RNA sequence: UUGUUUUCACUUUCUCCCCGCACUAAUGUGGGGAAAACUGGCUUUAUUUCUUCAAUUAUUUUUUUUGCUGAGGA
RNA sequence: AUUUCACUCAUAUUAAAUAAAAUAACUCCAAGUGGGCCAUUUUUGGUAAGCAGAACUGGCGAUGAGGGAUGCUCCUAACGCUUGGAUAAGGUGCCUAAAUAUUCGCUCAUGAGAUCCCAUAAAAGGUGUUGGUUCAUAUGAACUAGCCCUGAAAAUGGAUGGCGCUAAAGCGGA
RNA sequence: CCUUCGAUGUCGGCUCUUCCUAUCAUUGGGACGCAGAAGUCUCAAAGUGUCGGAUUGUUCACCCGCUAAUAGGGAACGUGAGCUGGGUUUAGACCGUCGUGAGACAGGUUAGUUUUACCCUACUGAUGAAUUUUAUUAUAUAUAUACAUAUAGUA
RNA sequence: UGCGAAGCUAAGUCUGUUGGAUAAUGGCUGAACGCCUCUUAAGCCAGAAACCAUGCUGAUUAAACAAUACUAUCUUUUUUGUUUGCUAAUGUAAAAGAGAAAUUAUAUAUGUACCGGUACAUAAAUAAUCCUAUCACCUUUUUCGUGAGCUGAGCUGUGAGCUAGGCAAUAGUUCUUUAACAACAAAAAAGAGCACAAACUGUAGACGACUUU
């Protein structure tokens, strides 16, 4: 809302709640980038959501399907369309808000090296009872005709290994900095030391 | 209300729009699926339609009314001068599709290949491919190593040699032939070996093999709906002519549907036709290329008087059973099944 | 909605049980089995020293409470299967055309021929960890054995359903392959 | 929107235009009350050409006076300033459109020596 | 044709005893018996700044930070 | 019966209450109108009808504004031009201003459901689940009514308004 | 009798497309009063196909025949600036019945002008610029960068 | 009137796939309900001319994009400015610290060490956190890290710091705190070929367009 851009890791979020939050942010003017859109969850069984998408697919202008509703199978495009449906995209301001959103499957080159945020108000773990059925957007997209799921999976595992190496290096650096801080806390003046200790620094 | 009598629709909606093809050359939409177990090999070739003849062959179909009898079959002659491999393109898979990593070139390319990059070659000073071919061998190996490391689809750029044909055209047709076979390393080695030499038809195809043919049909300009879609002629009494579709749609929807046949362009369409059998791969060297064991005469494939509207087949050729889309001289892409 | 409801399952002698986040691994002399129960709200306490496992539900409604005994039966099935292989004895019954069974691929991929004299091979694979052979006592019998009861019974069902008769009176044309008995080795 | 300059309140600017005068050349913008039957503007539909009404009337303490806080008086003679000799502070003068240059110069001279302001002081020079 | 009176049955245990004697969801547990009286309740005296003096209504008196407006000219 | 004289029957709150009751009463001249329609309730003919014919009141007409996505007649509310405040109807996940509010239950639908008018659904069923009632030594029955399910089929592609929503953004409350 | 009487071209056929499913055949199933064969009832299913002729203006109908099946419907009773014009439904004429008569007749018969697209859209094909507040699934020797990168012409 | 090449043409000739996930249904394990039960719970299987892919057609259907080949006076730093139709020349949908790269599970996770398991730690209002800001100047005493040139190594500069000193701010009470990014113009310093048309073609065609020389 007050950042240059917000990168949201869409894994484990419910599609509609995520889209509502994103749409409000975009209308308020905050640029967001949604990554790992293939791991979005939807409440209801996979078969039920596939039935819904087949209903969507049966929908076209029979005079000319080119003008018909473009259906779009990538999970990132599905999230984009849901956000657009939650947005006044036929006005100039609504179109600007829509264009302020960027959706990706996986984590591409700039967004895998920056902080990813999470919206707790749309997390499946917090919004669905454990005994109720849900589906995975990437799986639904593959059943509908996306057929890029496995490639995203292997790219994700490679990114996981790279991130693990980076995290190990970061942890070592943090431990070294911590030990340096403890060794230097004894060299500053006692008054400054008591100030830091009193205020928990 | 419903139709009084039902009959199937005129024409196939799967070949829409019936517009002119973007290009004369037949373009592979998809190559055969890669099988790692097989050794590396080429999957496609380009030749030129020379003409048609007929052959006599003995049938070996038990339980058929033909069987041991000798039958006559129409065949198409495609002149296939050896192609020249000049390039290597590496492809890697991304969620957005196949992405080119890089294309490397051979140390030398022919003026025939260079002509394809020019609209006016005669008046230009032919500076294309003149200073990018002096790239260091180290940089070439670097690019090839990166291709081996990161790419999963390998294609070799190869071009035809129209000077070996009676074509008036001088600029070569150049295409990518996907290498299907073993590992990325083996594919790269296989193409690197023949990075600059001729690729004959025999190394790509074997006799008695089924292949697909990709080409552009014979053009006919704009044709009426009767010829273009095969609709029925209206009766002789029709006031404003009979060569048309009577009703082009119901009142509602208040539009004309895209499924209604209309006048428009006919022919010059891109077509991929499957299962044409290679009857013979006739070599340029031998003088009895059109001879058989039952004929033992000394004659080549070219009929006396020449191939009409084409010329004389002086190079490697292959005899395809049946017909193939396109005029004479048309470039024809042969693809493995 | 009952506040707490538990059930206890005794661990047999020669098995080793590991339960982490309701992902159970049971090891025995006849192999190892793995089952995930992460689809149920369950608190599992494995007592390695004094044997037994207790599965407890908090605030369970009857629909969920019905799954406690299901989980317990699955666990004891795992135990019995890993201590003594589950065995499904199956009979090839036929009226006029004897069914010719051939076992290949080191007791997998059983191929049957001459079912109603069709002279077409009907082959069925065995699920992982399942071995199919022919009995040494009765000629028309088939053993489907293995540690995992699910896999073994599914293999028997696959064999039975690959040989169903079509377009005839089913209650008159009784030929087929039928699970005669369920036991252990 | 109202505009307020000192004690002056102009309750509305951008004078009312005749309905549909924007897209018909034969319909001039001069206001006419739409008599009509189903006329949108007459029925006061939202978002179309509001009609003038007495509610827009200006405060009568500052009604007819100009931005200089004076009432304008149009003269065509030097002899038509005698009333202004006693009202020089609340009347400004404006010269009539059809007064020649000579008479205009005389009127400006008389107004200045009467310290009465002139609206169109630099006309025709 | 209402009142009046009587009986038992009602509590905590980080207590004890027996049985299962580790069987529990449990740093405990199920069943069967005892115990006083911490806990809980009541009766007296002093206090309400250790702590509480609530809430609602009636009746009164203030208070923090602040938006908009200034007709008139006796 | 009338007439004339006497006496006197609250009025200082007014021969019961309340009343921007004299914004009255009366007279003259004259316009337009004299096809009506709708809603609640009652009602006649008709199988029924957005059908035909009546009664009361209110509306539409003649009338905009906020809401019901949309709508001549429904709800709030009727209108000079403004500045603040606070509300009605109705809403507070996004579209869309305001609750992903709080608190307690119910519901999983392989065609869930979701604001009067209003945009259809029945007889008959369910060993789905949630509460109740009455009978039989924690069991077997019979009922009962909430939500859900079957019953439930139409023609361009399609509509709780759309997206979507299941630890509701559904249903019944607070 | 709500909309059209300062006009929405009123039957049928031909042509052509699409849609529905309450499925005739074809696919896979369940039940049978199911031995086999044939059939009947029924489920998921609209992907594919549902014909040639005699008579009649006909729709409808009825036969001949093929077929695997010759299923039922919608789209302004789909479709007349698409046709045709046999019927109905102007003016000529004939018959029968009715009428004194002029004339009438869901009684029959015969002959009787079927206008316009060059506009918008739709559809079918055919040229074609311009596209930075635009785009990025990278680019750099086990290593940094969106605080970045990208001009343009030709092919 | 015969015959009638070439070209069109059908009545002539050739060609017209296989995977995934499912519906009906039949089943597996299995409680509810000691038994039973395809689930009318959880968890599974096989399965149709249907569905989605594969394949095919288009892709100015994405005002889409990549690699390649060649080329256009062109390309890199500083100062001042953008206060006959033109010939110097400016725009922001969003700077005020626009700070923050592990992964995952939600009836638990993550690291480490051994052989998915075992053991041990860590975390569990997680951003309710952490990191980054103000110490000007100049001089003095000095310490530690990086760039130019030089020969693993010395010097200069740069960043941070140590000791000591004195040295500045002032515009009348605030009117946005002119502070960012990107571009452009002028002046200075350094490095650097095609296409259309035309004639021809006819694999094309109403004209454009397209295939060619």
Tab-separated table of N, CA, C and O (backbone and C1' of nucleotides) in Angstrom, chain A residues 14 16-17 20 24 27 43 47-48 51 58-62 82 85-86 88 121 126-130 132, chain F residues 93-98 100-101 107-113 156-158 162-169:
chain	number	residue	atom	x	y	z
A	14	UNK	N	-6.331	-18.863	-1.112
A	14	UNK	CA	-7.602	-19.117	-1.772
A	14	UNK	C	-7.818	-18.089	-2.873
A	14	UNK	O	-7.573	-16.896	-2.676
A	16	UNK	N	-10.331	-16.624	-4.611
A	16	UNK	CA	-11.217	-15.474	-4.522
A	16	UNK	C	-10.780	-14.451	-3.494
A	16	UNK	O	-10.809	-13.246	-3.755
A	17	UNK	N	-10.385	-14.909	-2.307
A	17	UNK	CA	-9.934	-13.985	-1.273
A	17	UNK	C	-8.655	-13.273	-1.693
A	17	UNK	O	-8.515	-12.055	-1.504
A	20	UNK	N	-9.591	-10.645	-4.235
A	20	UNK	CA	-10.238	-9.479	-3.640
A	20	UNK	C	-9.216	-8.554	-2.995
A	20	UNK	O	-9.241	-7.332	-3.202
A	24	UNK	N	-8.316	-4.705	-4.349
A	24	UNK	CA	-8.390	-3.504	-3.527
A	24	UNK	C	-7.050	-2.782	-3.488
A	24	UNK	O	-6.999	-1.549	-3.580
A	27	UNK	N	-6.533	-0.959	-6.835
A	27	UNK	CA	-7.374	0.226	-6.936
A	27	UNK	C	-6.841	1.349	-6.061
A	27	UNK	O	-6.888	2.521	-6.447
A	43	UNK	N	-11.426	-23.604	-2.882
A	43	UNK	CA	-12.281	-24.469	-2.087
A	43	UNK	C	-13.205	-25.272	-2.991
A	43	UNK	O	-13.553	-24.851	-4.095
A	47	UNK	N	-12.860	-32.101	-8.934
A	47	UNK	CA	-13.872	-32.406	-9.937
A	47	UNK	C	-14.898	-31.288	-10.041
A	47	UNK	O	-15.323	-30.927	-11.141
A	48	UNK	N	-15.318	-30.739	-8.904
A	48	UNK	CA	-16.295	-29.657	-8.917
A	48	UNK	C	-15.746	-28.422	-9.625
A	48	UNK	O	-16.434	-27.803	-10.450
A	51	UNK	N	-15.647	-29.039	-13.286
A	51	UNK	CA	-16.976	-28.847	-13.851
A	51	UNK	C	-17.253	-27.371	-14.086
A	51	UNK	O	-17.812	-26.988	-15.121
A	58	UNK	N	-17.575	-24.052	-22.301
A	58	UNK	CA	-18.699	-24.219	-23.216
A	58	UNK	C	-19.268	-22.876	-23.649
A	58	UNK	O	-20.227	-22.817	-24.421
A	59	UNK	N	-18.667	-21.797	-23.173
A	59	UNK	CA	-19.200	-20.454	-23.320
A	59	UNK	C	-18.413	-19.720	-24.397
A	59	UNK	O	-17.204	-19.517	-24.255
A	60	UNK	N	-19.095	-19.328	-25.469
A	60	UNK	CA	-18.446	-18.662	-26.589
A	60	UNK	C	-19.512	-18.053	-27.482
A	60	UNK	O	-20.645	-18.535	-27.524
A	61	UNK	N	-19.146	-16.985	-28.188
A	61	UNK	CA	-20.062	-16.390	-29.156
A	61	UNK	C	-20.125	-17.290	-30.378
A	61	UNK	O	-19.161	-17.378	-31.141
A	62	UNK	N	-21.257	-17.968	-30.565
A	62	UNK	CA	-21.340	-18.956	-31.630
A	62	UNK	C	-21.263	-18.325	-33.010
A	62	UNK	O	-20.936	-19.019	-33.975
A	82	UNK	N	-9.611	-13.383	-12.671
A	82	UNK	CA	-10.415	-13.215	-11.463
A	82	UNK	C	-10.257	-11.812	-10.885
A	82	UNK	O	-11.244	-11.163	-10.505
A	85	UNK	N	-12.195	-9.436	-12.992
A	85	UNK	CA	-13.602	-9.524	-12.659
A	85	UNK	C	-13.950	-8.835	-11.362
A	85	UNK	O	-15.105	-8.453	-11.161
A	86	UNK	N	-12.978	-8.683	-10.466
A	86	UNK	CA	-13.187	-7.938	-9.230
A	86	UNK	C	-12.806	-6.468	-9.354
A	86	UNK	O	-12.476	-5.831	-8.347
A	88	UNK	N	-13.176	-2.552	-11.829
A	88	UNK	CA	-13.888	-1.800	-12.885
A	88	UNK	C	-13.006	-1.555	-14.103
A	88	UNK	O	-12.638	-0.431	-14.441
A	121	UNK	N	-5.231	-13.411	5.563
A	121	UNK	CA	-6.678	-13.426	5.410
A	121	UNK	C	-7.136	-14.277	4.251
A	121	UNK	O	-8.339	-14.505	4.114
A	126	UNK	N	-5.895	-21.079	7.235
A	126	UNK	CA	-6.674	-20.266	8.152
A	126	UNK	C	-8.121	-20.094	7.723
A	126	UNK	O	-8.940	-19.668	8.540
A	127	UNK	N	-8.461	-20.399	6.472
A	127	UNK	CA	-9.799	-20.112	5.988
A	127	UNK	C	-10.628	-21.336	5.633
A	127	UNK	O	-11.830	-21.184	5.394
A	128	UNK	N	-10.050	-22.532	5.594
A	128	UNK	CA	-10.807	-23.739	5.290
A	128	UNK	C	-10.687	-24.727	6.436
A	128	UNK	O	-9.585	-24.968	6.938
A	129	UNK	N	-11.816	-25.299	6.841
A	129	UNK	CA	-11.787	-26.388	7.804
A	129	UNK	C	-11.080	-27.591	7.199
A	129	UNK	O	-11.180	-27.851	5.999
A	130	UNK	N	-10.359	-28.332	8.043
A	130	UNK	CA	-9.477	-29.380	7.546
A	130	UNK	C	-10.228	-30.520	6.874
A	130	UNK	O	-9.624	-31.279	6.111
A	132	UNK	N	-12.740	-30.299	4.713
A	132	UNK	CA	-13.470	-29.842	3.543
A	132	UNK	C	-12.550	-29.809	2.335
A	132	UNK	O	-11.365	-29.489	2.449
F	93	G	P	-18.592	-7.466	3.881
F	93	G	O5'	-17.356	-8.024	3.057
F	93	G	C5'	-16.026	-7.717	3.439
F	93	G	C4'	-15.062	-8.061	2.339
F	93	G	C3'	-15.134	-7.183	1.105
F	93	G	O3'	-14.404	-5.983	1.254
F	93	G	C1'	-15.109	-9.451	0.459
F	94	C	P	-14.787	-4.695	0.384
F	94	C	O5'	-14.341	-5.085	-1.089
F	94	C	C5'	-12.972	-5.154	-1.450
F	94	C	C4'	-12.830	-5.432	-2.921
F	94	C	C3'	-13.640	-4.525	-3.826
F	94	C	O3'	-13.029	-3.279	-4.073
F	94	C	C1'	-14.010	-6.750	-4.454
F	95	C	P	-13.955	-1.991	-4.263
F	95	C	O5'	-14.772	-2.307	-5.590
F	95	C	C5'	-14.103	-2.385	-6.837
F	95	C	C4'	-14.998	-2.873	-7.944
F	95	C	C3'	-16.214	-2.030	-8.262
F	95	C	O3'	-15.903	-0.863	-8.995
F	95	C	C1'	-16.802	-4.314	-8.276
F	96	U	P	-16.699	0.496	-8.707
F	96	U	O5'	-16.752	0.578	-7.119
F	96	U	C5'	-17.138	1.776	-6.457
F	96	U	C4'	-17.536	1.525	-5.023
F	96	U	C3'	-16.686	0.506	-4.268
F	96	U	O3'	-16.565	0.904	-2.906
F	96	U	C1'	-18.942	-0.193	-4.277
F	97	A	P	-15.448	1.964	-2.456
F	97	A	O5'	-16.303	3.194	-1.921
F	97	A	C5'	-15.724	4.218	-1.128
F	97	A	C4'	-16.618	4.566	0.034
F	97	A	C3'	-16.690	3.514	1.125
F	97	A	O3'	-15.665	3.704	2.076
F	97	A	C1'	-18.879	4.189	0.512
F	98	A	P	-14.688	2.508	2.476
F	98	A	O5'	-15.341	1.938	3.804
F	98	A	C5'	-15.834	2.814	4.804
F	98	A	C4'	-16.985	2.187	5.541
F	98	A	C3'	-16.809	0.718	5.876
F	98	A	O3'	-16.070	0.525	7.066
F	98	A	C1'	-18.935	1.062	4.903
F	100	U	P	-12.804	-5.406	7.922
F	100	U	O5'	-12.665	-6.416	6.699
F	100	U	C5'	-11.922	-7.622	6.826
F	100	U	C4'	-12.820	-8.833	6.832
F	100	U	C3'	-12.228	-10.078	7.489
F	100	U	O3'	-13.278	-10.809	8.114
F	100	U	C1'	-12.818	-10.578	5.280
F	101	A	P	-13.223	-11.113	9.684
F	101	A	O5'	-13.267	-9.673	10.350
F	101	A	C5'	-14.415	-8.849	10.232
F	101	A	C4'	-14.714	-8.159	11.536
F	101	A	C3'	-15.116	-9.062	12.685
F	101	A	O3'	-14.002	-9.660	13.316
F	101	A	C1'	-16.574	-7.208	12.581
F	107	U	P	-25.676	-29.991	10.127
F	107	U	O5'	-25.583	-29.399	8.657
F	107	U	C5'	-26.722	-29.351	7.816
F	107	U	C4'	-26.377	-28.739	6.490
F	107	U	C3'	-25.117	-29.275	5.847
F	107	U	O3'	-25.340	-30.502	5.187
F	107	U	C1'	-25.120	-26.918	5.733
F	108	C	P	-24.124	-31.510	4.955
F	108	C	O5'	-23.413	-30.921	3.667
F	108	C	C5'	-24.022	-31.033	2.389
F	108	C	C4'	-22.986	-31.181	1.308
F	108	C	C3'	-21.907	-32.217	1.597
F	108	C	O3'	-21.510	-32.840	0.380
F	108	C	C1'	-20.917	-30.078	1.358
F	109	A	P	-22.354	-34.079	-0.191
F	109	A	O5'	-23.174	-33.454	-1.401
F	109	A	C5'	-22.497	-32.779	-2.447
F	109	A	C4'	-23.444	-32.044	-3.358
F	109	A	C3'	-22.787	-31.000	-4.249
F	109	A	O3'	-22.340	-31.555	-5.475
F	109	A	C1'	-24.612	-30.025	-3.095
F	110	U	P	-20.818	-32.032	-5.670
F	110	U	O5'	-20.812	-32.692	-7.116
F	110	U	C5'	-21.424	-32.040	-8.223
F	110	U	C4'	-21.664	-32.991	-9.369
F	110	U	C3'	-22.636	-34.131	-9.083
F	110	U	O3'	-23.316	-34.474	-10.288
F	110	U	C1'	-20.533	-35.023	-9.644
F	111	G	P	-24.825	-33.992	-10.540
F	111	G	O5'	-24.698	-32.424	-10.761
F	111	G	C5'	-25.326	-31.511	-9.869
F	111	G	C4'	-24.927	-30.090	-10.167
F	111	G	C3'	-25.731	-29.022	-9.434
F	111	G	O3'	-24.900	-27.883	-9.224
F	111	G	C1'	-26.015	-28.754	-11.751
F	112	A	P	-24.036	-27.746	-7.882
F	112	A	O5'	-25.125	-27.785	-6.730
F	112	A	C5'	-25.972	-26.675	-6.488
F	112	A	C4'	-26.348	-26.602	-5.035
F	112	A	C3'	-27.134	-25.378	-4.603
F	112	A	O3'	-28.520	-25.562	-4.824
F	112	A	C1'	-25.385	-25.847	-3.053
F	113	G	P	-29.481	-24.321	-5.139
F	113	G	O5'	-29.215	-23.313	-3.942
F	113	G	C5'	-29.834	-23.484	-2.676
F	113	G	C4'	-29.389	-22.401	-1.733
F	113	G	C3'	-29.556	-20.990	-2.269
F	113	G	O3'	-30.847	-20.477	-2.002
F	113	G	C1'	-27.348	-21.274	-1.482
F	156	U	P	-31.322	-21.003	-29.409
F	156	U	O5'	-29.839	-20.508	-29.689
F	156	U	C5'	-28.900	-21.338	-30.362
F	156	U	C4'	-27.533	-20.703	-30.403
F	156	U	C3'	-26.852	-20.545	-29.049
F	156	U	O3'	-25.440	-20.596	-29.238
F	156	U	C1'	-27.191	-18.421	-29.996
F	157	G	P	-24.569	-21.786	-28.610
F	157	G	O5'	-23.727	-21.073	-27.469
F	157	G	C5'	-23.004	-21.826	-26.506
F	157	G	C4'	-22.888	-21.079	-25.204
F	157	G	C3'	-24.210	-20.813	-24.500
F	157	G	O3'	-24.005	-20.833	-23.092
F	157	G	C1'	-23.180	-18.754	-25.050
F	158	G	P	-24.685	-21.976	-22.198
F	158	G	O5'	-25.376	-21.164	-21.025
F	158	G	C5'	-24.593	-20.335	-20.182
F	158	G	C4'	-25.413	-19.240	-19.558
F	158	G	C3'	-26.422	-18.584	-20.493
F	158	G	O3'	-27.723	-18.446	-19.883
F	158	G	C1'	-24.854	-16.957	-19.692
F	162	G	P	-24.880	-12.990	-11.724
F	162	G	O5'	-23.458	-12.368	-12.050
F	162	G	C5'	-23.088	-12.062	-13.383
F	162	G	C4'	-21.708	-11.472	-13.432
F	162	G	C3'	-20.637	-12.266	-12.706
F	162	G	O3'	-20.115	-13.322	-13.484
F	162	G	C1'	-20.514	-10.017	-12.042
F	163	C	P	-19.582	-14.652	-12.773
F	163	C	O5'	-18.268	-14.178	-12.015
F	163	C	C5'	-17.110	-13.791	-12.736
F	163	C	C4'	-16.107	-13.115	-11.841
F	163	C	C3'	-15.489	-13.979	-10.755
F	163	C	O3'	-14.422	-14.781	-11.224
F	163	C	C1'	-16.182	-11.929	-9.825
F	164	G	P	-14.567	-16.377	-11.278
F	164	G	O5'	-14.782	-16.813	-9.765
F	164	G	C5'	-13.718	-16.776	-8.830
F	164	G	C4'	-14.133	-16.049	-7.580
F	164	G	C3'	-14.498	-16.915	-6.389
F	164	G	O3'	-13.357	-17.329	-5.664
F	164	G	C1'	-16.158	-15.269	-6.706
F	165	C	P	-13.356	-18.707	-4.850
F	165	C	O5'	-14.256	-18.408	-3.578
F	165	C	C5'	-13.867	-17.455	-2.602
F	165	C	C4'	-14.996	-17.195	-1.645
F	165	C	C3'	-15.455	-18.402	-0.848
F	165	C	O3'	-14.695	-18.560	0.333
F	165	C	C1'	-17.328	-17.322	-1.818
F	166	U	P	-13.871	-19.905	0.606
F	166	U	O5'	-14.914	-20.824	1.367
F	166	U	C5'	-15.683	-20.293	2.436
F	166	U	C4'	-16.526	-21.351	3.092
F	166	U	C3'	-15.754	-22.563	3.605
F	166	U	O3'	-16.340	-23.026	4.818
F	166	U	C1'	-17.384	-23.261	2.049
F	167	A	P	-15.431	-23.732	5.937
F	167	A	O5'	-14.928	-22.538	6.867
F	167	A	C5'	-15.624	-22.231	8.068
F	167	A	C4'	-14.872	-21.300	8.994
F	167	A	C3'	-14.137	-20.122	8.354
F	167	A	O3'	-14.344	-18.955	9.146
F	167	A	C1'	-12.673	-21.309	9.768
F	168	A	P	-15.552	-17.954	8.817
F	168	A	O5'	-15.512	-17.797	7.235
F	168	A	C5'	-16.416	-18.512	6.402
F	168	A	C4'	-16.949	-17.647	5.295
F	168	A	C3'	-18.096	-16.723	5.695
F	168	A	O3'	-18.055	-15.551	4.888
F	168	A	C1'	-18.812	-18.156	3.989
F	169	A	P	-17.198	-14.269	5.320
F	169	A	O5'	-17.720	-13.127	4.342
F	169	A	C5'	-19.076	-12.690	4.378
F	169	A	C4'	-19.784	-12.921	3.066
F	169	A	C3'	-20.155	-14.368	2.769
F	169	A	O3'	-21.334	-14.389	1.971
F	169	A	C1'	-18.669	-13.591	1.116
